[PDB]
Amino acid sequence: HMNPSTTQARVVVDELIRGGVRDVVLCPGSRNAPLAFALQDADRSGRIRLHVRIDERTAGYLAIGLAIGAGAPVCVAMTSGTAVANLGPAVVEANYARVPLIVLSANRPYELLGTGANQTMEQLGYFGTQVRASISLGLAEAAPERTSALNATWRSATCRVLAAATGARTANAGPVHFDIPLREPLVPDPEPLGAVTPPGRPAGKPWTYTPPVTFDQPLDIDLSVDTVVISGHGAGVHPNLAALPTVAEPTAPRSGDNPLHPLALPLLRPQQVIMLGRPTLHRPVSVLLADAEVPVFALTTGPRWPDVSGNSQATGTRAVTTGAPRPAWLDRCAAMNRHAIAAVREQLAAHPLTTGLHVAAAVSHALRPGDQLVLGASNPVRDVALAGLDTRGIRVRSNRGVAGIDGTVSTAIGAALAYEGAHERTGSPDSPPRTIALIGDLTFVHDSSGLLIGPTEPIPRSLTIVVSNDNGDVSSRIFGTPHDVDVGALCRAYHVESRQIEVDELGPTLDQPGAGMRVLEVKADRSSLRQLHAAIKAAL
Amino acid sequence: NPSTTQARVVVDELIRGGVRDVVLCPGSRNAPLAFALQDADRSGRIRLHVRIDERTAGYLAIGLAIGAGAPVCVAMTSGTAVANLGPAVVEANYARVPLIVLSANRPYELLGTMEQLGYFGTQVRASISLGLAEAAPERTSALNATWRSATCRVLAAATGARTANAGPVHFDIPLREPVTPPGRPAGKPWTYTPPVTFDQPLDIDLSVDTVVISGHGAGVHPNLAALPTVAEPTAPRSGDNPLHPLALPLLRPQQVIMLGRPTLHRPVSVLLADAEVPVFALTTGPRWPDVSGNSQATGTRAVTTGAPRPAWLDRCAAMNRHAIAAVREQLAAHPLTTGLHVAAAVSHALRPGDQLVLGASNPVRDVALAGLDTRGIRVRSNRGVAGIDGTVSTAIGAALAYEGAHERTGSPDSPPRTIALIGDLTFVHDSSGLLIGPTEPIPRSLTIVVSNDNGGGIFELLEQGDPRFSDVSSRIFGTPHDVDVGALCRAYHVESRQIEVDELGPTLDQPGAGMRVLEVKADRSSLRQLHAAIKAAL
Amino acid sequence: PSTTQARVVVDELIRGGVRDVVLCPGSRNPLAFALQDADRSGRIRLHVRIDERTAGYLAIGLAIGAGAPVCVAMTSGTAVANLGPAVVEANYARVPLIVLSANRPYELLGTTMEQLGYFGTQVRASISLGLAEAAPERTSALNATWRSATCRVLAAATGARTANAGPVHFDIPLTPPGRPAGKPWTYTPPVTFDQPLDIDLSVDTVVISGHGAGVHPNLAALPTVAEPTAPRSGDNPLHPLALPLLRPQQVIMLGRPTLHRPVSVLLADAEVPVFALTTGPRWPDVSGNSQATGTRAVTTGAPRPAWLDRCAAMNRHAIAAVREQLAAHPLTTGLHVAAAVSHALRPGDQLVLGASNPVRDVALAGLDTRGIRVRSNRGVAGIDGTVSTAIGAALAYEGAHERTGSPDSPPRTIALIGDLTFVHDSSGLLIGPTEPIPRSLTIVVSNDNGGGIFELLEQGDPRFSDVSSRIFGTPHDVDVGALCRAYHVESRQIEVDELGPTLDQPGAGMRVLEVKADRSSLRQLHAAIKAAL
Ligand SMILES: Cc1ncc(C[n+]2csc(CCOP(=O)(O)OP(=O)(O)O)c2C)c(N)n1
Ligand SMILES: Cc1ncc(C[n+]2csc(CCOP(=O)(O)OP(=O)(O)O)c2C)c(N)n1
Ligand SMILES: O=C(O)c1cc(O)c2ccccc2c1O
Ligand SMILES: O=C(O)c1cc(O)c2ccccc2c1O
Ligand SMILES: [Cl-]
Ligand SMILES: [Cl-]
Ligand SMILES: [Cl-]
Ligand SMILES: [Cl-]
Ligand SMILES: [Mg+2]
Ligand SMILES: [Mg+2]
């Protein structure tokens, strides 16, 4: 009846859907045709949304966007060869950002490794320690009597792939390499003489159910000691710490309503630091975490705990708090937070030229509750932190794992599609929410291929990309001249609407109703930034 | 600083070892041998190429190595460099390309930049770490010897000087966070390793009806020059008796001599798997291919007795004329331009001495179906893993190294031409390879011909191209993109022109800017029927 | 500079719970001197061996004896290869093993550190300290960097944050105080790993508990087939031979089962839901039949009286069939020796079981694990290193009893192993005069002169009788008594009826009791028990 490659591909796709996979990114190939056929039919029946891309490296960052936008595991299926190697960059990012990314690689049978067979390499284990698991399905046997047993083993392995990627039993979500060797026949047989897919558990249940896991590690912390909370990427929400002064990275969730501008920390003298997540962005933050006199308590949601400090007195998951912060200490930190905010506000106005900070400040004001903000992990994240954005009621995403230039555009597109997707299922007939991306010009040009979306492929409903164009070791001689790439020409090539506006119009133009996907380019300056940052520092 | 001394010794020995080009990317950490390479660039001892995209940088290095046969260095500088260099390193492994990867590790920092993947173990020929530099005026003669000896190991491993198996090498130079000692006289390398002769004679009787199938990495065998030879475009031709690939299924060879690693044509793979046909594998290195475990014997050269029967050579020649006529006649009888028409136009426009860079998918297959005469012509293609990524940067590096070899011959004639034939998906995959800063070296005679059928044409010719999949194959296989290629080249400031297949000939004869892209629109909705008409007219 | 780094690291390892360290004489290795100072000062115990393989398995025993992390110090360019087996066992049995290495960063590399592939697949973490400097202006900062990293090593080995103990590779490439009151530099409270599973005990349920299983009070009433190394939670045991006689409709699987074919068949039956309750993040599956994973059970309902009565009946029939067929058998088999050891055990004893038949035979003899501590290398079920495992297990066990100030002599550690197992790791008996030696260790060897377990497998079928003596039985004809005397260890040959009384007498700290056994009748015995059911 049904050939083994088709049966295996349909069973795997079926178990992945039951595991919560709503979006799959597919790259074209011949060896992965079984997976391609099963995925396309699951897209026809509405069980998943399929995204086709041509460039596997940007496809991996699209899949990362599809996962951080709503929280679901996301699969990316590709053929054998360098197609798997091109997933390298996205796997590394997903490792340090803890993104549940499933690399579903088709492969030749392993017996062909070493024979010179076309388009065949050492795929299994290619990703080394960067993945949470390298799992290989077997080669499918042509034995309809073993069909019952193979369905159980295939579905149980797919569940193991899903459990490791989502961190269902480790609290350490990350990328997983799921390698599937496939042999001919690679296409489905004539459907008149066809079969039905071996069934899973009744009522759409996963083959192996993993109920919610709890990882608890309580820590004693006395709050009467003058305490500042520094929250970075992957930080959890802690209600018992919402009163304390908090220096929060843009991608960190806010526990309370007592902010502290990063520029204010070096001008204060905390006696005790509570570190939430993986702080990385601010240098004065990094300075304070080096100082050995100030005790540091680390609180993480997963088992990995950051090494950005040397005087880590203790690491846990939550705090059992004793006491309450001194009101004089609270008055001091709030006083200095207002002083830092005003210093940034005055020097921005006192500056003649539009810099990247002005663009970042303009986007911050235009934000509204419910919006999603995607930030290039270079300057845009630091700039929005200097402009003191209030991340309450907005979801802020950024590839803070390795903070690479790769794939920023694709991540924005993916996060938008995932966000607007979860808005449909909540039943609201209201319009889809907004996703605004702020990225530099060198990052936009570098991942301009990420703008490519085939005519038949899903397109974000309300994504606006704001490109702050500052036109910019012997390896730094390429930065000595402007790359001179017309942002509008790239957008025309990839059939994307573009507009070159000014920072004054940034607000009103961002409020124009949803026009699908669009790119807004703001011209900015880089020559005067050294004076602006020196002006702000002197104003403090 | 004893480290800047180390860096100057290594760069000198690498130049003595034949390295004429190095590729750099800006990174968070300082580049390995960053400043020493810069002095070597201004001195004219070496040519530096800088790129932003580390993936396109790896493939540019491959192009710089295969265009002239020299070893090439790429200097990793960031924490994403290992991941992005993966594709090029894998291709360098399977295509046997001398690729040196320079990295600088920090021994005073806690471990537990570089992001370690698992491929370095399986792909590289050697992993050599220099060692930390320490000041010692009484050991300058000794540290000069250790550094240059290890540098000679790195080059010998990468070029296959002692193994006959070129490939990528990982060279690590540890650094401590912040004149040149001499080498051998006359510019000679520190440790002279004479290239080795790797010899495996094999007895083959040529009176048995024999066909030769030469693939990637095949050698030149003068004693086999008379036999009917089905040769891939990248294989150097050794005779004047070509056998069209479509004529192979109309014959019954009793013996097959397989040169190098064949990767094209399903009739070839069916023949090589036939257990009733002895297959003899002749390779230039230690690796050897088998299709279905049907390689009877391995070697490097044939010790031949006998000669092909004149009746056998006549049958092969008759079947060859039928195949050539069928392709020419059916192409003329087809209204729409396909990628196969473009391949025949590019093939008829080449001249002796030109370089041809062929992308994967149909272009490299279509050129073979067009009967391209590869003699006097240098043909390149990344057949190691047959990826469609990095083919634009590979052509650019191939043009740059090929032109530099013509400059060093001192001929006043214009630089030789490099013509690249790639699909549209291939072009879209690595369009970023066109972004070259005005400071960097740019080719002077590179023409990229893009055969644009708005998607993946080869899938029309495979099993998923069957009409019973017509309703499902468009999205997941054809994958149209609707990209404006001229607008892309415009954005990157590359001369671009859309032309018809009839104007393709004369357009390549006229020179132009040192780099330009010629886009020919094509159709893939008639591809499967054009190929069926060719098979039936055989 | 390196002497200070080595002495800082040793202090944090002692503050982290390390009480024993194994090392081997090697071509080099500072850490040796620092470890030496702590040994004379009494802060750790040092154990030296010549055989690096046996050194790795000694450290495993030192870990599972009391539950502490243990360090082993490689010193040559053969230690990685020789420590391989012990690292693999530590990985699969979740044993806190710290492997200490020393790289040379000022030397040409790649043209005492032999790299194999197992480190990247077996260890929980790989942490290299980094080269030391000389500026005493940052000695306070270097102190924190070393003690923090050492705390990372200990946390990965003991599973402090991941609940998955295992081996760790620590590279120290070639006195600033710690936190006051001897606490570790970075405190990490042990983590609680929780997954509640809804299970209806009203369905006819059996509990199968294997290696690494936890203790479950709300499952104490259910019939329980428990492997020897499993800790028992209730008092309704179900003899393993009774399982094929019953027809359960639901299975709760604790830990990682590895024994008894009937169990493997039951766990694979697609008509029976299996629930895997584990103590860590890994979970086992036989044929993809595990339908849910968890760490504890939220139980509704109660077991039917009809189901419990049926289970108690077949249990009784099985214990009686084994106790009776063992009496009718004239020759002494390894199954008689397992029953003799089990009935000679008192509460508070430690029992070390080798693989092959000894671990299975003790289960067939129905030993009551309550009050006693069973140890076995069930991670990969190998016959190597079992002797050194029992020596280290004895040492750490008596060490925990010495530190409680009890006046009574050390508690008993009895090891039941086979002959092939004894020969495989006979070198582990070679212990120098200055090295620590157990004071209450008895190694009972059931010597049937070959592999008895093979007579019970398909190769033991009589149609292979003429072709299976060489390649499965493997007779050795080794004089165990002469071997023990050569290594200066007490040895005595006794009969099964003499095993109990001799075990009750305390003798030299290490004694090897060898009982002659037969395997030619093993397949016939087991066929007799099956027919008696
Ligand atoms: C990196 C990579 N990803 C995917 C593939 C699978 N693949 C093989 S041929 C092909 C289509 C290429 O299309 P195009 O370059 O337009 O060529 P055409 O066959 O249409 O001439 C694809 C995606 C590959 N070979 N390499
Ligand atoms: C290192 C290792 N090699 C081989 C095996 C395979 N094996 C399993 S049981 C066994 C026989 C051991 O015989 P013995 O220790 O005398 O025990 P018996 O079954 O006779 O009681 C062997 C070789 C193993 N488990 N470990
Ligand atoms: O001859 C060659 O060039 C060549 C190159 C390769 O990368 C091979 C890989 C596997 C098996 C055979 C191979 C081979 O024969
Ligand atoms: O529970 C345990 O102790 C345990 C231990 C292991 O080493 C495992 C290995 C693979 C699969 C499951 C495992 C498991 O459940
Ligand atoms: Cl950016
Ligand atoms: Cl014929
Ligand atoms: Cl190809
Ligand atoms: Cl066993
Ligand atoms: Mg195409
Ligand atoms: Mg035995």
Coordinates of C-alpha atoms in Angstrom, one line a residue, chain A residues 12-359:
Chain A
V12 CA 6.0 12.5 11.9
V13 CA 4.0 15.6 10.7
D14 CA 1.0 14.3 12.6
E15 CA 2.8 13.9 15.9
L16 CA 4.4 17.4 15.5
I17 CA 1.0 19.0 15.1
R18 CA -0.3 17.3 18.2
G19 CA 2.8 18.6 20.0
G20 CA 1.8 22.2 19.5
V21 CA 3.6 23.1 16.2
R22 CA 1.5 25.6 14.4
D23 CA 4.1 26.9 11.9
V24 CA 6.6 25.1 9.8
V25 CA 9.2 26.6 7.5
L26 CA 10.0 24.5 4.4
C27 CA 12.9 24.9 2.1
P28 CA 12.7 23.3 -1.4
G29 CA 14.5 20.1 -2.2
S30 CA 14.2 16.6 -3.7
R31 CA 15.3 14.4 -0.8
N32 CA 12.8 16.1 1.6
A33 CA 9.9 15.6 -0.8
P34 CA 8.2 13.1 1.7
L35 CA 8.2 15.8 4.4
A36 CA 7.2 18.5 1.8
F37 CA 4.1 16.5 0.7
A38 CA 2.9 15.7 4.2
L39 CA 3.4 19.3 5.3
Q40 CA 1.6 20.7 2.2
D41 CA -1.4 18.5 2.9
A42 CA -1.5 19.5 6.5
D43 CA -1.5 23.1 5.3
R44 CA -4.4 22.3 3.0
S45 CA -6.5 21.1 5.8
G46 CA -5.7 24.0 8.1
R47 CA -3.8 22.1 10.8
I48 CA -0.6 24.2 10.3
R49 CA 0.5 27.3 8.4
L50 CA 3.4 26.5 6.0
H51 CA 6.0 29.1 5.1
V52 CA 8.2 28.4 2.0
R53 CA 11.6 30.1 1.7
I54 CA 14.6 29.7 -0.6
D55 CA 17.5 30.7 1.6
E56 CA 17.9 28.2 4.4
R57 CA 19.9 30.6 6.6
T58 CA 17.3 33.3 6.6
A59 CA 14.6 30.6 6.9
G60 CA 16.2 29.6 10.2
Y61 CA 15.8 33.1 11.5
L62 CA 12.2 33.2 10.2
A63 CA 11.5 30.1 12.3
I64 CA 13.1 31.8 15.3
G65 CA 10.7 34.7 14.8
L66 CA 7.8 32.3 14.5
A67 CA 8.7 30.9 17.9
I68 CA 9.4 34.0 20.0
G69 CA 6.3 35.7 18.7
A70 CA 3.8 33.4 20.5
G71 CA 5.8 30.8 22.4
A72 CA 5.2 27.7 20.2
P73 CA 7.8 25.2 19.0
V74 CA 8.5 25.7 15.3
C75 CA 9.9 23.3 12.7
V76 CA 12.2 24.1 9.8
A77 CA 12.5 21.3 7.2
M78 CA 15.2 21.2 4.5
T79 CA 17.0 18.8 2.3
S80 CA 20.4 17.2 2.8
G81 CA 23.8 18.8 2.2
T82 CA 24.8 22.4 2.9
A83 CA 21.1 23.1 3.4
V84 CA 21.5 21.7 6.9
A85 CA 24.8 23.6 7.4
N86 CA 23.1 26.9 6.6
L87 CA 21.0 26.4 9.7
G88 CA 24.2 26.8 11.8
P89 CA 23.7 30.5 12.6
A90 CA 20.1 30.2 13.6
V91 CA 20.9 27.1 15.8
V92 CA 23.6 29.1 17.7
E93 CA 21.2 32.0 18.3
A94 CA 18.4 29.6 19.4
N95 CA 20.8 27.9 21.8
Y96 CA 21.8 31.0 23.8
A97 CA 18.3 32.6 23.5
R98 CA 16.6 29.3 24.4
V99 CA 14.3 29.2 21.4
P100 CA 12.4 25.9 20.7
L101 CA 13.7 25.3 17.1
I102 CA 13.3 21.9 15.4
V103 CA 15.7 21.4 12.5
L104 CA 14.0 18.6 10.5
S105 CA 16.7 17.5 8.1
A106 CA 16.0 15.0 5.4
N107 CA 19.0 12.7 4.6
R108 CA 20.2 10.0 2.4
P109 CA 20.4 6.6 4.1
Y110 CA 23.5 6.5 6.4
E111 CA 24.9 3.5 4.4
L112 CA 25.7 6.0 1.7
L113 CA 28.0 8.1 3.9
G114 CA 31.5 7.6 2.5
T115 CA 30.5 6.3 -0.9
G116 CA 30.7 9.6 -2.7
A117 CA 26.9 9.8 -3.1
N118 CA 25.7 13.1 -4.4
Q119 CA 24.7 15.8 -1.9
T120 CA 25.6 13.7 1.2
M121 CA 27.6 14.7 4.2
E122 CA 28.0 14.0 7.9
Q123 CA 24.7 15.6 9.0
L124 CA 24.0 13.8 12.3
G125 CA 26.1 15.5 14.9
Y126 CA 26.9 18.5 12.7
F127 CA 25.6 20.9 15.3
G128 CA 27.6 19.5 18.2
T129 CA 26.8 20.8 21.7
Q130 CA 24.8 23.7 20.3
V131 CA 21.6 21.6 20.2
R132 CA 19.7 20.0 23.1
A133 CA 19.5 16.7 21.2
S134 CA 20.6 15.1 18.0
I135 CA 17.9 12.4 17.3
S136 CA 17.7 10.3 14.2
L137 CA 14.6 8.4 13.1
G138 CA 15.5 5.1 11.6
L139 CA 15.2 4.2 7.9
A140 CA 11.7 3.2 7.2
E141 CA 11.2 -0.5 6.6
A142 CA 8.9 -2.0 4.0
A143 CA 7.0 -4.3 6.3
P144 CA 3.3 -3.8 6.7
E145 CA 3.3 -6.3 9.6
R146 CA 5.7 -4.0 11.6
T147 CA 3.5 -1.0 10.7
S148 CA 2.0 -1.0 14.2
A149 CA 5.3 -1.1 16.0
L150 CA 6.9 1.5 13.8
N151 CA 4.1 4.0 14.4
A152 CA 4.8 3.8 18.1
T153 CA 8.5 4.3 17.8
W154 CA 8.2 7.1 15.3
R155 CA 5.7 9.0 17.4
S156 CA 7.6 8.5 20.6
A157 CA 10.8 9.8 19.0
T158 CA 8.9 12.9 17.7
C159 CA 7.7 13.4 21.2
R160 CA 11.3 13.2 22.5
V161 CA 12.3 15.8 19.9
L162 CA 9.5 18.1 21.1
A163 CA 10.1 17.6 24.8
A164 CA 13.8 18.5 24.4
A165 CA 13.1 21.6 22.2
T166 CA 10.4 23.0 24.5
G167 CA 12.3 22.0 27.6
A168 CA 9.2 20.2 28.9
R169 CA 11.3 18.2 31.4
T170 CA 14.5 20.3 31.6
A171 CA 13.2 23.9 31.7
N172 CA 16.0 24.5 29.1
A173 CA 14.3 25.1 25.8
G174 CA 16.5 25.1 22.7
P175 CA 17.2 23.8 19.2
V176 CA 17.0 20.2 18.3
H177 CA 18.3 18.3 15.3
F178 CA 15.8 15.8 14.0
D179 CA 17.4 13.9 11.1
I180 CA 15.3 11.6 9.0
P181 CA 17.0 9.4 6.4
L182 CA 14.8 8.7 3.4
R183 CA 15.0 6.5 0.4
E184 CA 13.1 6.1 -2.8
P185 CA 10.2 6.0 -3.6
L186 CA 10.1 9.6 -2.4
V187 CA 6.7 10.7 -3.7
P188 CA 3.3 9.3 -2.7
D189 CA 1.9 6.5 -4.7
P190 CA -1.4 6.7 -6.7
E191 CA -4.1 7.6 -4.2
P192 CA -6.7 5.1 -5.7
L193 CA -4.4 2.3 -4.3
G194 CA -3.6 4.2 -1.2
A195 CA -3.8 3.7 2.6
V196 CA -4.6 5.9 5.7
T197 CA -1.9 7.1 8.1
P198 CA -1.4 4.9 11.2
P199 CA -3.4 6.6 14.0
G200 CA -2.2 8.3 17.1
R201 CA -3.8 8.5 20.5
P202 CA -7.5 9.4 20.6
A203 CA -8.6 13.0 20.8
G204 CA -5.5 14.6 19.4
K205 CA -3.4 13.8 22.5
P206 CA 0.3 13.6 22.1
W207 CA 1.7 10.0 21.9
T208 CA 3.7 10.7 25.2
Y209 CA 2.0 13.3 27.4
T210 CA 4.3 15.5 29.5
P211 CA 2.3 17.5 32.1
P212 CA 3.7 20.9 33.2
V213 CA 7.0 20.8 35.0
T214 CA 8.1 22.9 37.9
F215 CA 11.8 23.8 38.7
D216 CA 11.9 25.4 42.1
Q217 CA 15.0 26.7 43.9
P218 CA 14.2 29.1 46.7
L219 CA 16.7 31.8 47.9
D220 CA 16.8 33.9 51.1
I221 CA 17.1 37.6 50.4
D222 CA 16.9 40.5 52.9
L223 CA 15.4 43.5 51.1
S224 CA 16.2 46.0 53.9
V225 CA 19.7 46.1 52.5
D226 CA 20.0 48.7 49.7
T227 CA 19.1 46.6 46.7
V228 CA 18.9 47.1 42.9
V229 CA 17.4 44.5 40.5
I230 CA 19.0 44.0 37.1
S231 CA 16.8 42.1 34.7
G232 CA 18.1 40.8 31.3
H233 CA 17.0 38.5 28.5
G234 CA 15.0 35.5 29.7
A235 CA 14.1 37.0 33.1
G236 CA 11.1 35.8 35.0
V237 CA 8.4 37.9 36.6
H238 CA 8.8 38.2 40.4
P239 CA 5.9 40.0 42.2
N240 CA 7.8 40.1 45.5
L241 CA 10.5 42.2 43.9
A242 CA 8.2 44.7 42.1
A243 CA 8.9 47.5 44.7
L244 CA 12.7 47.5 44.3
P245 CA 14.5 49.8 41.8
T246 CA 15.0 47.9 38.6
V247 CA 17.4 48.3 35.6
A248 CA 15.5 46.3 32.9
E249 CA 16.8 45.5 29.4
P250 CA 14.2 46.2 26.7
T251 CA 13.5 42.5 26.2
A252 CA 13.0 41.8 29.9
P253 CA 9.5 41.7 31.4
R254 CA 8.7 44.3 34.0
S255 CA 7.9 43.0 37.5
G256 CA 6.7 46.3 38.9
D257 CA 6.7 50.1 38.5
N258 CA 10.0 51.4 40.0
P259 CA 12.3 51.9 37.0
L260 CA 15.9 53.0 37.2
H261 CA 17.7 54.3 34.1
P262 CA 20.9 52.4 33.3
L263 CA 22.9 55.7 33.2
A264 CA 21.9 56.2 36.9
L265 CA 23.5 53.0 38.2
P266 CA 27.1 54.2 38.1
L267 CA 26.1 57.3 40.1
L268 CA 24.6 55.2 42.9
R269 CA 26.1 52.8 45.4
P270 CA 24.0 49.7 45.9
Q271 CA 25.0 47.2 48.6
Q272 CA 23.3 44.2 47.1
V273 CA 22.3 43.2 43.5
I274 CA 19.6 40.8 42.4
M275 CA 20.2 39.5 38.9
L276 CA 17.3 38.3 36.8
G277 CA 17.9 36.4 33.6
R278 CA 21.0 36.9 31.5
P279 CA 22.1 40.6 31.6
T280 CA 24.4 41.6 28.8
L281 CA 23.6 45.0 27.3
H282 CA 24.8 47.8 29.6
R283 CA 28.5 48.4 30.3
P284 CA 28.0 50.2 33.7
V285 CA 25.9 47.1 34.5
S286 CA 28.8 44.9 33.6
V287 CA 31.1 47.1 35.6
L288 CA 29.0 46.8 38.8
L289 CA 28.7 43.0 38.4
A290 CA 32.5 42.7 38.4
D291 CA 33.0 44.6 41.7
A292 CA 33.6 41.9 44.3
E293 CA 32.2 43.9 47.3
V294 CA 28.6 44.0 46.1
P295 CA 26.9 40.6 46.6
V296 CA 25.0 39.2 43.7
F297 CA 22.0 36.9 43.8
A298 CA 21.1 35.3 40.5
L299 CA 17.5 34.2 39.7
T300 CA 16.9 32.2 36.5
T301 CA 13.9 30.4 35.1
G302 CA 16.1 27.6 33.6
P303 CA 19.0 25.5 35.0
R304 CA 21.7 27.6 33.3
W305 CA 22.9 30.5 35.4
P306 CA 24.8 33.5 34.0
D307 CA 28.5 33.8 34.5
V308 CA 28.6 37.6 34.0
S309 CA 29.4 38.0 37.6
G310 CA 32.2 36.6 39.8
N311 CA 30.7 37.4 43.3
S312 CA 27.5 35.4 42.7
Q313 CA 26.7 34.6 46.4
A314 CA 23.8 32.3 45.4
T315 CA 21.7 31.2 42.4
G316 CA 18.1 30.1 42.5
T317 CA 14.7 30.5 40.8
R318 CA 12.7 32.6 43.2
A319 CA 13.2 34.8 46.3
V320 CA 11.8 34.3 49.7
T321 CA 12.1 38.0 50.8
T322 CA 12.6 39.2 54.3
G323 CA 12.2 42.9 55.3
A324 CA 11.4 45.9 53.1
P325 CA 13.5 48.5 51.3
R326 CA 14.5 51.6 53.1
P327 CA 12.3 54.5 52.0
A328 CA 15.3 56.8 51.9
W329 CA 17.0 54.4 49.5
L330 CA 13.9 54.3 47.3
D331 CA 13.8 58.2 47.3
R332 CA 17.4 58.3 46.2
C333 CA 17.0 55.9 43.2
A334 CA 13.8 57.5 42.0
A335 CA 15.5 60.9 42.3
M336 CA 18.4 59.8 40.2
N337 CA 16.2 58.0 37.7
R338 CA 14.4 61.3 37.0
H339 CA 17.7 63.1 36.7
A340 CA 19.0 60.6 34.1
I341 CA 15.7 60.8 32.1
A342 CA 15.8 64.6 32.0
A343 CA 19.5 64.7 31.0
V344 CA 18.8 62.4 28.0
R345 CA 15.7 64.5 27.1
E346 CA 17.5 67.8 27.2
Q347 CA 20.6 66.9 25.2
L348 CA 18.5 65.2 22.5
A349 CA 16.6 68.5 22.0
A350 CA 19.9 70.6 22.3
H351 CA 21.3 68.5 19.4
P352 CA 20.9 69.9 15.8
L353 CA 21.1 66.7 13.7
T354 CA 18.9 63.7 13.7
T355 CA 20.8 60.8 15.3
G356 CA 19.9 57.2 15.9
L357 CA 18.8 58.1 19.4
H358 CA 16.2 60.5 18.0
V359 CA 14.8 57.7 15.8

